[PDB]
Design a protein around this ligand. Structure first.
Ligand SMILES: [Fe+3]
Ligand SMILES: [Fe+3]
Ligand SMILES: [Zn+2]
Ligand SMILES: [Zn+2]
Ligand SMILES: [Zn+2]
Ligand SMILES: [Zn+2]
Lengths: 314, 309
């Protein structure tokens, strides 16, 4: 177990071996349902340790090799169990107040991590869909509390700082305020749009209208309007294809625990069906060279998304 | 159509808006674009992501946009439709595939426009390869792919600091993770492997561009690819889908700090289920492994012994 580093890309690899279950080994009882000694009862939201953590509190001594940088796999890997119900398809299927509690519980986990003062980064994300390898069907999300900043966020951080120095302001605010044609949804505190620089077949970024760099700075009405943002956007993506779409959601926010004027937090949602509902796989172009292609303009895709989003209201 | 640029990550997006008989293969011999009496072809892609005469790029106020100017090609690797993998083909056939790609790169080098020549191959229905007929893709590009750009910086910077090629140094020290070598090439699982079955194939001589390769090096490349890809085909029980990409320098001047290599990402975990790049990977560029690169190198190397031939 250790965090290795790629000397050409700077990307980190969370090496944490665990034995892999054989095809004759049952999947076994849902690890996220209430009523087991692990899970307890009477809860709405359960944050618990991942069964196979990629970062741990007292990690083994890192494997070393002369030319390479290795960091101890230190921190927390957690599962946010989003509801006690097993057969709900999606986060978007849950009631607004249930979404609020999930968000509030995540915010609160971040506070704990902030206070504690070690963890460099709080990474919240969600994978959805059998077709992208989500075998555990019970709605859930993930938190990694990390000793390092995620390389992708680290790159966004540098480019953000360098525009703030040059022009005096945050580029994200400037981008959010200007954008309206590619708008998918907005309310008192959040804007959700297909970015100009979209890479995935149905992409939406969700920004707060006010400049927040950290989850923990959100006002209780911000957190509430966020639940509504997430619900309706996710609902739009669940309906646009004609069949529920697999998707990846990540929270991009500043490192722990001090705020920033140049970086502005956002949720990125990569919806992984093309317009015709066949799956889009990240292949040689994407994984091999970080080159993306789109068979359809982002502007046209915001339309389809916004049009399908109309059905969701109710 | 145009190439858009992500202002936060530096990444490029190739935006390009877009009846035939069932059982028709557009890469099969006797096709409208193919003809007959051929062993290998490099064709224009039917729905190219770059082209020679691209329309005016769609400009936006806060973003950089560049014309979608380049060549998108398919490499039909064989006339036979029914061959599963590049690695089922004989050494001589793989030699003509390599040679063809090299000649097309030389052409692109001489013509003097293209910034980058990107050769890659996707394999397997599970990762979206719906045209089963053995093929490879070339993108001749007006920019340097961002992952390759990054590798260049970091190799450049190391070179300046330590006065030698980091890649040449890395290749010398590979023993434990070695999977195969021959006269001109080494194949190993890198210490920094991020996919479940990753193998990089490097030339022993320092080379930066495919077109510098000698006839003997090409022949030995043919073999290294065959045996390595044979190893990954066998390692999990059934044929494994995979991605292969050639990381080489920009066109057309050789680099002392960068050293060409092929990366192969075999996408089954040891258990034989498909790994998908997800939120950690796409959303954060963090990668996880459930098995050490060392143990995986041993598993591949053990599977590879069956392939020596
Ligand atoms: Fe972002
Ligand atoms: Fe590389
Ligand atoms: Zn359950
Ligand atoms: Zn801002
Ligand atoms: Zn064919
Ligand atoms: Zn070298």
């Amino acid at each position: 177990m250790e965090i290795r580093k790629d000397p050409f890309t700077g990307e980190y690899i969370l090496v944490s071996p665990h034995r892999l279950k054989r095809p004759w080994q049952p999947e076994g009882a849902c690890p996220f349902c209430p009523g087991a000694p692990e899970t307890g009862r009477g809860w709405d939201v359960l944050i618990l340790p991942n069964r196979y953590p990629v970062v741990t509190e007292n990690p083994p001594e890192p494997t070393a090799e002369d030319l390479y940088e290795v960091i101890p796999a230190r921190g927390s890997s957690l599962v946010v169990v989003e509801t006690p119900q097993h057969d709900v398809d999606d986060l978007s299927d849950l009631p607004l107040g249930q979404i609020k509690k999930i968000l509030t519980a995540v915010a609160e986990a971040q506070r704990k991590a902030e206070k504690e003062g070690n963890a460099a980064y709080f990474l919240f994300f969600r994978n959805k869909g059998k077709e992208i390898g989500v075998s555990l069907t019970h709605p859930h999300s993930q938190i990694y509390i990390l000793p390092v900043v995620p390389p992708r966020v680290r790159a966004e951080l540098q480019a953000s700082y360098e525009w703030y120095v040059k022009h005096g302001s945050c580029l994200h605010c400037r981008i959010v305020e200007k954008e309206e044609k590619r708008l998918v949804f907005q309310n008192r505190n959040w804007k959700a749009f297909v970015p100009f620089y979209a890479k995935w077949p149905h992409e939406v970024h969700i920004y707060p209208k006010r400049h927040r760099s950290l989850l923990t700075e959100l006002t209780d009405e911000e957190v509430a309007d966020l639940a509504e943002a997430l619900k309706i956007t996710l609902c739009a993506l669940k309906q646009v294809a004609g069949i529920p779409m697999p998707y990846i959601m990540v929270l991009h926010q500043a490192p722990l625990p001090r705020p920033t004027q140049y970086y502005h937090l956002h949720f990125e949602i990569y919806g992984m069906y093309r317009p015709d509902g066949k799956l889009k796989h990240a292949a040689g172009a994407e994984l091999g060279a970080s080159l993306f292609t789109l068979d359809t303009t982002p502007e046209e895709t915001a339309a389809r998304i916004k049009a399908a989003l109309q059905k969701c209201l109710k």
